[PDB]
Symmetry: D2
Subunit: 267 residues, 4 copies
Amino acid sequence: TVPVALVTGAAKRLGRSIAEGLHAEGYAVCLHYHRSAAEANALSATLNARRPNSAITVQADLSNVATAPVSSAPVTLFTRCAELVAACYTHWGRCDVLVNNASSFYPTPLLREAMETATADLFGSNAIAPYFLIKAFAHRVAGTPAKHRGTNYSIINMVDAMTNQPLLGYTIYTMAKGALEGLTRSAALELAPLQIRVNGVGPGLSVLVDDMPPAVWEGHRSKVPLYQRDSSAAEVSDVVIFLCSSKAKYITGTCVKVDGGYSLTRA
Amino acid sequence: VPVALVTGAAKRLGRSIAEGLHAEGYAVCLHYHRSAAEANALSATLNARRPNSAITVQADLSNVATAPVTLFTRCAELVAACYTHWGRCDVLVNNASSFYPTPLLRGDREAMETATADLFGSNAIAPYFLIKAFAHRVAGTPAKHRGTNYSIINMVDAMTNQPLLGYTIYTMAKGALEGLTRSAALELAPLQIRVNGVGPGLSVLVDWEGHRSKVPLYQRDSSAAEVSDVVIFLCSSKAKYITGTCVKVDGGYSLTRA
Amino acid sequence: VPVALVTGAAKRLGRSIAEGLHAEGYAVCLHYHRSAAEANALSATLNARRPNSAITVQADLSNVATAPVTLFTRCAELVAACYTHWGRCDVLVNNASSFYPTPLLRGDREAMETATADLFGSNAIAPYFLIKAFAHRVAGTPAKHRGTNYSIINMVDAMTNQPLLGYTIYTMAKGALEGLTRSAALELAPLQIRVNGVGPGLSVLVDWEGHRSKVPLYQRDSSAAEVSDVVIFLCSSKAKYITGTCVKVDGGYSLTRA
Amino acid sequence: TVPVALVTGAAKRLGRSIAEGLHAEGYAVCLHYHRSAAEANALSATLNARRPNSAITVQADLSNVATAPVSSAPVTLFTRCAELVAACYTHWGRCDVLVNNASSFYPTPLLREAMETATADLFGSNAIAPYFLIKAFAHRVAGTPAKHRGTNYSIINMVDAMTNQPLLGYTIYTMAKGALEGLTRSAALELAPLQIRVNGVGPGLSVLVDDMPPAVWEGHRSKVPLYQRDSSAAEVSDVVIFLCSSKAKYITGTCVKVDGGYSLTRA
Ligand SMILES: NC(=O)C1=CN([C@@H]2O[C@H](COP(=O)(O)OP(=O)(O)OC[C@H]3O[C@@H](n4cnc5c(N)ncnc54)[C@H](OP(=O)(O)O)[C@@H]3O)[C@@H](O)[C@H]2O)C=CC1
Ligand SMILES: NC(=O)C1=CN([C@@H]2O[C@H](COP(=O)(O)OP(=O)(O)OC[C@H]3O[C@@H](n4cnc5c(N)ncnc54)[C@H](OP(=O)(O)O)[C@@H]3O)[C@@H](O)[C@H]2O)C=CC1
Ligand SMILES: NC(=O)C1=CN([C@@H]2O[C@H](COP(=O)(O)OP(=O)(O)OC[C@H]3O[C@@H](n4cnc5c(N)ncnc54)[C@H](OP(=O)(O)O)[C@@H]3O)[C@@H](O)[C@H]2O)C=CC1
Ligand SMILES: NC(=O)C1=CN([C@@H]2O[C@H](COP(=O)(O)OP(=O)(O)OC[C@H]3O[C@@H](n4cnc5c(N)ncnc54)[C@H](OP(=O)(O)O)[C@@H]3O)[C@@H](O)[C@H]2O)C=CC1
Ligand SMILES: CN(Cc1cnc2nc(N)nc(N)c2n1)c1ccc(C(=O)N[C@@H](CCC(=O)O)C(=O)O)cc1
Ligand SMILES: CN(Cc1cnc2nc(N)nc(N)c2n1)c1ccc(C(=O)N[C@@H](CCC(=O)O)C(=O)O)cc1
Ligand SMILES: CN(Cc1cnc2nc(N)nc(N)c2n1)c1ccc(C(=O)N[C@@H](CCC(=O)O)C(=O)O)cc1
Ligand SMILES: CN(Cc1cnc2nc(N)nc(N)c2n1)c1ccc(C(=O)N[C@@H](CCC(=O)O)C(=O)O)cc1
């Protein structure tokens, strides 16, 4: 049987490595994107060239805002999330794995309309959208006759090993990852009767090159105890792939740091 | 005369905190949403004990616009009310909180959206804006006239790490509130504003034998004072080196397993 | 008149805790190992303030036999000393602790063995036996005459989760002490004995700019009182619902990263 | 190249599944035992029959006590630990992985000579021995010319997902696993310059059958959220095997619970 994975924010960086890793194990993957349409579609062609009808793309703004319909009233985040899960059942009749990877990240310093949009985008992508996606995912397994349910349902939330040692100026982001840790434990307990495992993976510093200038990149990366560098995308994605595997079937409600020991440091 | 702003101060733990802060000598702003009678009464009682020592401000802390006025603005006005009235705000206790189920399994969408805005707003988004407004006011006060003992206390939950079945949005919001405690504690340290949490286990359940009987210490839920006295302590000059920490007040219930 | 047993009470934080407990009215047993002069002096000062309010007992708390006498026996005698003298022991503060490096990399074996016995004994094995002896005495006292406020405070470390390079045995012993706090808090709940921890960050470093300057709140280490006042609070009847918990007193240093 | 793993307490149950799992990946394994000599030696024959010269056995009491020499003065735990690591270099010239699995577990209620032996056995097996074994392991890699060091050194400590919700009456055991968590973080930081990763795996309830009578076994196992049963030995060992793999190379200083969500419960 060919299981299916829905990966949010899958066009590049960590999300693309998670989609590639799952595809390498045999999963058909639904690649969600927000602004990186070209990149998502290129990845999709690359995957379908390797194995036909093994990848599809779907667009969505996961911020906690209402959007205009694509054909009466404004569409809610809840609906958009339900439609992402639906795309998987419509195309392949199942959704075995959900990886909540999409996430906005920018400052919200404590010391007008921008603040409201930042709250909805940072909390929606990192926490409210994952909540609605898990709810739609669980509803679809619950509506599937037991004799037709898959045998290895897994949800992975991408959290952050370092949020307990806050990055100064990123309060809303930090709060939203703490809510995501709370969703991981609450959903793991609640969904355990359906055999749906829910776990987190929390990178420390990963693929810094694209986000920081040389000198800043060098300076951050030097404080990681193990290897004195940021991780590669595969160093993170291989752990997500292992948690979705049948070998990790007794693991639920846990968050695994993939941080090279950065959380063990002190100023 | 120091000033304390207590959210959800009309009754139960919020009332107990206001009383305790009032006994150490603070002037207290009693925020309420639906409990106007109870709020006004408490205020009258406190003013009877010591004139012009209590006021009341109403506000919905759900993350919704009202007749428009955003949540932020409402939060800022609550902080502005302490200044306007008494010219200062030294303590802030984020206690108001909605709490009911949001089951993952089994007009409905609109109610779901109201529930996320109410549970997330009261437990996390409002506390954030309140913290941001409190900070902005301390920063704007010339160093020479600042208070010497600014403390912000967030009421968390000792048991959210062992989730209550069917309360996901609430649990997620308390997790966001723990994050806010650590982040604001770090960022507001230069202004000497301490930010800490207090996490009750089972408290004032009546205001049940199945639940109470599982608490290791005393086999009962706590009284309101058993929690507010901890909150007053954290606000005292003696807990001056304590910041970014959450103190459980749960009789050992978090030490238990099924 | 309640009685407190403070280990490593001769100076620094231990001295500050004894002073603070003495000011709330407790009779205090001042344990010491090598600091006889300082211990005896403190005792004289306290007895000058209030007659027959302080004593001194010497004991090595390393996990070694002495001239044989085991550590357990020595621990039991320390508890027996409070009873013998004043007929009661209501509070126990496990503060004594050895702290020096045990590097993983780069007669030697005998010194390694002395180091494990001293660091593990003082920070964890002694506290265990002391707790076991304290419990045994409360259990043996007819319910009718027990105290009404038994508290055991273990001095932990807010920063052991971000280890100091080269102090493995010490870090492991503080981890064992956190375990003891939770286990004894759960097991001693029926006898109403509370067991909690207090974890300093950087305190009384002189009794350094590199270290101090990294503390978010105040950019300095704490004073002794900034830590002992927390310990006295936990021992007070007002923190009666608090059990099995560790309170950090670190100025936010545990919130930092390299 | 054939890497070597030293597994303590490897004769049965979880330890034997960890040794079997590592051997299946190609490692030569040194099987340490204390009282289960016959069982250790049988496993050793089974492994060597599958692949010659791939398994050896070594005996040792890991309690923090001195023992009589096997040929002047009484031998210390430190020496016995160093000799376990030495056995691997003597036989195969290397020791790539160390799994600290051996552990005593029995009550030490708070409410004569037995207490001293319990303290040394419970703290030695669960914490002091792991400390000395890691120290000997690190010393041997440090003494190996860099050009000859292996490329994937990993130490795994078996901890306990449930020690933060203490089992009534097991104080010394609980304290010793807390010290083992402290050793995991301290050693991960200190050894990171040598690229030696140190992580923990913490089962919840596993292979209960042998340790509990039917009715008690049934009652405990029913409180696990996921599956309402205790785990199998492989459900735990597959996670240890994954953490020793090159795919887990950016993970250090972390403890992964394998508990079916049991730590998420409350009384
Ligand atoms: N990189 C690192 O060091 C760290 C990573 N993590 C976590 O790992 C995960 C992956 O990290 P990384 O690859 O760096 O993440 P990115 O910052 O690269 O974001 C991944 C994607 O999320 C999407 N996204 C952002 N906002 C929205 C939105 N409003 N609606 C829908 N999608 C949105 C984007 O899609 P598009 O481009 O299509 O718009 C983007 O490509 C994240 O959850 C992150 O928080 C945690 C700690 C560190
Ligand atoms: N009680 C317990 O066992 C526990 C409590 N806690 C925490 O302690 C704190 C106090 O607990 P408790 O006293 O039980 O709290 P309540 O359930 O009694 O609520 C306190 C108050 O908050 C207010 N509130 C609710 N929704 C809103 C809203 N949308 N806008 C503004 N105000 C709102 C109410 O005001 P009004 O009545 O005026 O409308 C209410 O009186 C809470 O943060 C709670 O999560 C943690 C764990 C356990
Ligand atoms: N100071 C700090 O920054 C921090 C302290 N803490 C903790 O707070 C507590 C108090 O700290 P601090 O005041 O610095 O402690 P110290 O380093 O000053 O030691 C306190 C005392 O413990 C005693 N002691 C040491 N070894 C033994 C032994 N083998 N047997 C009996 N007694 C012994 C000593 O007694 P004598 O002098 O009479 O021999 C000594 O005065 C400790 O548990 C410590 O780990 C935690 C983090 C930081
Ligand atoms: N089973 C479970 O539910 C749980 C397991 N864990 C942990 O997982 C690991 C494996 O668990 P499990 O298989 O149940 O363990 P066992 O209790 O079966 O013990 C494993 C082995 O440890 C050895 N051992 C005990 N004392 C000593 C000693 N003094 N010196 C040397 N070796 C000694 C034994 O060797 P021999 O037989 O050769 O004497 C024994 O076979 C342990 O660290 C345990 O604490 C944690 C939580 C739950
Ligand atoms: C660790 N990290 C990498 C990084 C890149 N993309 C991500 N994307 C998401 N969704 N989540 C992350 N955690 C994330 N992290 C970082 C960390 C700090 C700064 C940095 O400090 N940047 C600010 C400035 C710092 C400040 O506000 O003081 C900037 O915008 O330049 C950048 C990237
Ligand atoms: C601790 N608590 C009291 C209580 C009362 N008011 C509060 N108010 C707020 N704001 N926050 C709280 N945590 C809170 N807690 C509890 C604890 C357990 C259950 C109980 O087990 N309840 C469920 C079961 C859930 C379900 O199956 O729907 C329920 O329906 O409430 C209720 C209240
Ligand atoms: C917080 N502290 C003060 C201090 C003083 N006495 C104590 N006494 C006890 N019992 N426990 C403590 N934690 C303690 N702490 C510190 C903190 C850092 C360093 C410091 O960085 N030191 C190293 C570096 C280690 C090395 O490379 O060997 C050292 O040699 O002590 C020293 C003392
Ligand atoms: C979860 N577990 C399985 C089990 C079996 N072997 C192990 N072996 C080790 N080394 N470590 C473990 N954690 C471990 N755990 C348990 C848990 C409780 C009891 C049980 O309660 N046993 C006591 C009695 C309980 C009590 O003392 O009150 C007994 O000896 O019968 C037994 C096994």
